Amino acid sequence: DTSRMEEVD
Amino acid sequence: SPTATVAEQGEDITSKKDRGVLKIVKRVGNGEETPMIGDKVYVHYKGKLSNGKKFDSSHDRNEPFVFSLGKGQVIKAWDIGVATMKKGEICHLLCKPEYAYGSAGSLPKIPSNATLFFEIELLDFKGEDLFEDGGIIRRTKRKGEGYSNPNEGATVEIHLEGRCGGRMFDCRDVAFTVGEGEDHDIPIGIDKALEKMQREEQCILYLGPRYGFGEAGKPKFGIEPNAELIYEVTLKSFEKAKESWEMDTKEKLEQAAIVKEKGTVYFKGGKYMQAVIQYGKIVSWLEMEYGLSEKESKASESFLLAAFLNLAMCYLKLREYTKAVECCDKALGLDSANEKGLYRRGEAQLLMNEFESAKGDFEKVLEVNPQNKAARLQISMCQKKAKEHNERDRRIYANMFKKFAEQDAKEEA
């Protein structure tokens, strides 16, 4: 679930 | 004696038709391809004056002379000449002073108003390799009137003809932004080549696997993955993008949001090459700026850190891990504690097999967010993959020790 590190800003 | 032959029976290959350049083919060449403007022409020649005196020769070196044809790098007569030749051809050229060195000559070797004789052997000829990788080979049909080339972001008006194994899949007048060809089903190669093109230029471009539609192909054009494409581009007109310093902060901040959103669209679509272009505009416009308002500076810094973190993401997905670390370094410059910047740095470093370097990055991630489960898994991954790298390195060394001992021992008889 630590897929934040794949999320763009 | 071979000078009187061309003087008697010679093909007047001049545009003006004034007997200035006369040709006679001594030895024919294979293929019906003739060299075009800007091509790298490899030739062998012998030069003899009006009486027959051998002034300068390449055969008295046996090493060929390479020059760009129709670029004014040789006498008028040669640029007209070699253009009519086939590969492997030997022809005798008779050149009037008007098409040679004029009344001026090239003293002490060439006299004033001298009718020169040549024996030119077209050894080989290649088109212009735009990025010296073989990815884009340009052949020019028409020279541009241009003084400036379009830039990444320029809106261009072009005519485009596209062939895949001789089959035409595209033939249209299209208007688009350089860097944003995908939007109009144009391969990245065209955008890249347009920056080296002039207004009113007509050229053929051979788009190699890297500058075409790539691994996915273009199903609507029935183009298979990494297919080689030949395009015919005519730069009808263009309007250049504003340079970084040509825009005020107000414009730069308005444009930052548009191109950031456009970049994110490309990213989500999996068009990472085009995502890198859009975010790279933010970096180009805002990285070196100073003397901004409190509100302007805080905003500029937000877009700048976003662009760097997004570019890291792009470069990771593009398998370009060095650029990814470069962007993480820039981002971590601005925000030394950024979770994503630190994590993505560890990702690209683990991929470049810099295990201990990456260990630290994922460790510094836990220092920030200790509830990040993924950094812990990647620390144990760094450990496991580093142990594998040493065993493998130990094996290769032990086997190359065997090779340079079982083969080197036979060095007796």
Author numbering:
A (entry chain B): 724 to 732
B (entry chain A): 13 to 425
Give sentences from the paper.
The results indicated that the Asp732 nitrogen formed a hydrogen bond with the OD1 atom of carboxylate group of Asn322 with a distance of 2.78 Å. Asp732 is also interacting to Lys272 and Lys352 with the help of three salt bridges SB1, SB2 and SB3 with a length of 3, 3.39 and 3.70 Å, respectively. Glu730 was involved in formation of hydrogen bonds, HB3, HB4, HB5, and HB6 with Lys352 and Arg356 with a length of 2.91, 2.78, 3.33 and 3.29 Å, respectively. We run the Vasco software that enables to display the electrostatic and hydrophobic surface and observed that in the complex surface the concave groove in the TPR domain is positively charged which makes long range attractions for the negatively charged C90 peptide. Similarly, for the complex structure we obtained a resolution of 2.49 Å with 62% spherical completeness.
FKBP51 is the co-chaperone to Hsp90 and belongs to the immunophilin family initially recognized for its involvement in regulation of steroid hormone receptor activity.
